[PDB]
């Protein structure tokens, strides 16, 4: 039983050295996306009530501020390219909930590509600085949408190696377990033979 417990500690080692250099890997692609799409989703919990309500209760809507609000609609469920529509959906309470509330695995590529058009289309009017001075309200859900997708696609990426660190990961303990039930026989015989 000795010759066994070391037999599993250096695959167990291995294995985990494989772990850590994915997972290491894995966290530096987290580093470089998503620090961003926190901050963003800060800003949002950020955001006041009047800021929102003055303009929601608008007469017309201003190009840029259109422009970055229709499609997080679509991204939102009720494609509705409607300024009606983004009243009645905007005007909810729940909202300030929803706010934080979507993630990015969610997104679709269709939108993906029509949100990415659309950044072509708006590319210009996609400024973070540039949209703040229509509204003090914007700015923070502008690098809001540019995050989200960001990951999206690139995530996919993440997905082969983020299953495959569940495989490890899983077997990794599984194995452990199974390394300490050794452990505890090779004491319970120390014991038993003194």
Do not use: C
Not at 29 to 37: A, G, N, S
Not at 58 to 73: A, S, T
Not at 88 to 109: M, P, Q, W, Y
């Amino acid at each position: 039983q000795k010759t066994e417990l070391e037999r599993l500690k250096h695959r167990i080692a291995e294995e985990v050295v494989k772990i850590e250099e994915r997972k290491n890997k894995i966290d530096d692609e987290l580093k470089e996306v998503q620090p961003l799409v926190n901050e963003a989703k800060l800003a949002v919990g950020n955001i006041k009530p009047e800021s929102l309500s003055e303009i929601r209760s608008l007469r017309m809507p201003p190009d840029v501020i259109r422009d970055i609000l229709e499609g997080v609609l679509r991204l939102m469920g009720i494609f509705d390219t409607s300024w009606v529509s983004m009243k009645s959906f905007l005007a909810k309470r729940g909202v300030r909930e929803d706010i934080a509330t979507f993630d990015a695995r969610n997104i679709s590529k269709e939108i993906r590509e029509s949100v990415e058009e659309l950044l072509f289309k708006n590319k210009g009017s996609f400024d973070p600085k540039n949209a703040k001075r229509a509204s003090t309200a914007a700015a923070p859900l502008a690098a809001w949408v540019k995050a989200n997708i960001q990951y999206s696609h690139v995530l996919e990426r993440i997905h082969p190696l983020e299953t495959e660190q569940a495989g490890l990961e899983s077997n990794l303990k599984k194995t452990e377990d199974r390394k300490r039930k050794l452990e505890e026989l090779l004491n319970s015989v120390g014991q038993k033979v003194s």
